[model samples]
Target: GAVHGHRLSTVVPSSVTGEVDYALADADLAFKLHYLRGVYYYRSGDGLATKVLKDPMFPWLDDHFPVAGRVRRAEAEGDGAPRRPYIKCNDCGVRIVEARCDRDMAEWIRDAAPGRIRQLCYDKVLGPELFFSPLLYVQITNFKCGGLALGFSWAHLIGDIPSAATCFNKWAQILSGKKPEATVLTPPNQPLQGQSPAAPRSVKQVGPMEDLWLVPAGRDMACYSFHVSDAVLKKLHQQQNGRQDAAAGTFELVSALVWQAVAKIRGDVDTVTVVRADAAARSGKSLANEMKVGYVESAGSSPAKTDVAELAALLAKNVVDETAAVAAFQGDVLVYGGANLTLVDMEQVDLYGLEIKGQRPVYVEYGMDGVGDEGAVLVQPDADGRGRLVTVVLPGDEIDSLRAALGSALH
Candidate 1:
């Protein structure tokens, strides 16, 4: 298993450990079935990131203790209410694994697939024995050429991506000996209007999560990642020169392109989930869910036949937000992400902003589980913001066809 006769290649794993008890906040309970899974890749700078991150996280865990907690269910409420899930807050800690790669970093990642990348994060989720599962997982891998990877397995229950943002950002901040500012850890400020979503669809009611926090959809899921270069983005925008309402931004445009591709591949995509997460929208929050949820449907024409700009304009102008409705339904287990062709807008989340000893990661990618059969697509800015990093998770069999369909258009 050596790369080009390097011969010394090897990989090894380590035991899990952590450094909590707290009932989950109200907003968190809503996202108990989902996860925010991703990884950050960097050139070996100051040296082993595991060494850089481990000890610092002791203090980091102290700051975000809820991450160290295990999951449990509360007894049924006194008056005929159902059993609720909560974090025990015992300080069992996050699952940490140290790994070594025999190959050079560039060789390992240059054309890496989601399957390969997932290993760095250990591909973990909360479990049957919820009491022992850590809400977060961090795997640090050191490559022969000094490339480093920090894999993050985050439980969406505790927070959104920005909340996930606070965890690692501050860990690096603390490594630099800077005291992080205290955060409010509050949920999104907008209150649910108590009415159903304007469009009325984004979630599918599942039986129940019970003690298991893993995904409900069992299709052999696969992921495909591609970068929509700057030229394509500009071309798409430039092609809209004749349109009157040309206000559709990158998120809408790219999502439209992908959505069209999916509709074509699946033969008719009627509804889609839209999740928007912006880092700066909330105030002083560190561990809370502040993302917005909405659903987009074909206004007039099927997405496959709809013109790109027209579809994009529809996506921009007609998306009906379902946050209030989504937040109201805590009555049963629900699944998101690909449950209905999920599309996430995370272009503003600062995916590579976390620095290690003055050196930021050269690349970072994020994905989520609990996706439905329709699949999910998440978009973010590339290192320079000139291109977009798009990650799609769909049934394994469709990946090849999707790549062909998307490649024909993208290339």
Candidate 2:
């Protein structure tokens, strides 16, 4: 919190308040606090979200958390449609929806269990569509025992889980006995180095050639998540540790494992189909040096089916290079001007027979340092503990097979 006389000010307009705006603001706040140098947000002249609903290839930007600015309302652009909030509260900021809970809901969520209330946080509450709605409703229908659902929408722009937790903790400090007008400390903003304007003012005009920059999804496609237990994680770590050139850290090993699994399912698929790995840039290194969040194609492709070991070796080789990591540390410097590659770009790559994998290198740690809602409840972080990691195997049909493959590799 700043002293009474020291309120934070910014050159960015204060008028923006929609989810996109808030998301951007949150990112700016994070930079000031030294959590991020800057955040990334994707904005296509046409509704990119809608485009994703239709053609998935709308070039999803990676690390675009601190959105540049609120997307222009479609109305202002004369699309004749009312400007709906493109981003949702859950996808944007700490959206808090307070309400009461009841018994029926309690049973459904296993209220007898500690922090059972978290189960009620369904897609409508935690997903990206809520920002489009006009009301902030606290869903109370499920709590047969009678209570309201307090939905929280936090912007990725503001910070990662750690940064958000820090803000929450600071806010709580203010609520307790510290300064009431608390705000994050600001750091130097790393301005964009060289960003190229996005092509075709309207996303509808975007073509397949642009697909390399954006990720496209199949119409029938759906995202699926898999849970790997702590035991499995430990086993994999042990196995990797025994290898002569075993890579250190969860991200590298996990990436190797997932790449092998994805390759197993994508047998004989086009070698051009990319296998992307997402990781966070924990240190304030250059954007490239930061975590590689999107996708990368494996070096080789084959018309013939490849063995899992072969693919694993290929994936390992792609990631094990310190040279690539060093290059990332220096600037390709293009991301600032925008053509920076992102996960969405990887999505657009032909992955039908392609593979996409993400590994969160940071330890997903959990703490109640700043969660203010008394209504706030404890939630499981991951299969192992309080922190959770998200891995999405794109082109959904392969989801189950991929899980099985991952299980096999873990053992």
Candidate 3:
């Protein structure tokens, strides 16, 4: 079975609390409404455990003090909602939830579960009372046969996914006895574009979010992660005229396939949103939504019937980075994997770099929360050191069609 069969049985976990001063944000705050989340699986005997991670974790948490802070707001006019947003860095620590699983990490991955990763990290977001909520959370799950899993939740208001993943990268460095430098939590010192009251091309607005920071919610969504092995990727590469373009690497080719598949099931797939982590700016420790948000439209070209090479060629070109445009807007809505189905290129990020005592984790995958009903697709380098791990959040029934589409395309 390509889909995972093993289920996770975790014990009730406890909460740990712990952040920043007057940090006024919106280039940074644009994505604060969303949460970036993921899970990492370390095989048994890899020096990973609840007790095993604490030592490097505290120092890792020290650099990200703002993560320990609470989301705050400003007063407004008679009929208006909470007017402004800021992070009041207090002594509140990140909530650490500890649990235990009876299965082995190997078995869990051998028969992987797409939805199980979400269960590892709590499903809750920041509150009706923003002051009481923790912007970040870490769940340490211990396995009976000696495996370790780290499930973490992060508010996009703090940073992008690269920033989310680096928290642990530094912890791993700490585990290896290397001290990390201080992290950057504030937005870049420069001004943004789109000063003229123009609506952003990528953002979709909802009603006043006020102190309750969250997306309105979903479309009976399902989470499924599957691996595209080298043979499969090679087949896909040749299936599309991808051989003609040397630039069409695994991300573009695979993303083009997903775009086509979703188009077939959903009917209209004229526009697609693309997200890329700012490589130079990501610097491992910097926290902010400095990510690039771009939109790709086929100009009425039906994505389903279009050649995979053509779509991927368009993907390589025509990417308009509207990070500033999205940041230029002033609304609390879904800019992430919302409205227009978004595809994230995370191949560059090191998903398996976190080394425990002396060995690296055997597996790791990333995801998003508070996404729009249209859903999101994240493409990353797989942990096995070959091929790619493609994770999708979409309408439940559409998942079946997607797998069928992929199955038909490859076979």
* lDDT (Cα atoms) of all candidates against the true structure: 0.71, 0.28, 0.71
What is the per-residue lDDT of model 2 for residues 55-104, given as tens digits with 9 covering 90 to 100?
21111111222322222222356654323222222222111222333344
Candidate 1, residues 46-96: lDDT per residue as tens digits? 555445567677777766766766677667558656665666656666777
What are the per-residue Cα lDDT tens digits for candidate 3 across 316-366?
A: 787777777677776665776665888888888877888766677777877
Error of 3 at 205 (Å): 1.7
- Candidate 1 stretches with Cα past 4 Å from truth are 1-21, 112-114, 186-200, 279-283, 333-335
What shift in Å separates residue 93 of candidate 2 from its native position after superposition? Answer: 9.7
Model 2 alpha-carbon drift over 4 Å, by segment: 1-95, 98-151, 157-162, 168-223, 237-243, 267-291, 294-297, 300-317, 320-390, 393-395, 403-411
RMSD of each: 4.9, 16.0, 4.7
The local distance difference test score of model 1 is 0.71
Consecutive 10-residue window with the lowest summed lDDT within model 2: 33-42
Residue 103 of model 3 has an lDDT of 68
**Local error of candidate 3 at residue 341 (angstroms):** 0.7
Task: State in Å the error of residue 147, model 1.
Answer: 1.0
Please say which candidate is ahead in lDDT: 1 or 2: 1
Query: Considering every candidate listed, which one attains the maximal TM-score?
Result: 1
TM-score against native, each model: 0.88, 0.42, 0.87
**What TM-score would you give candidate 3 relative to the actual structure?**
0.87
* CA lDDT, candidate 3, residue 141: 73
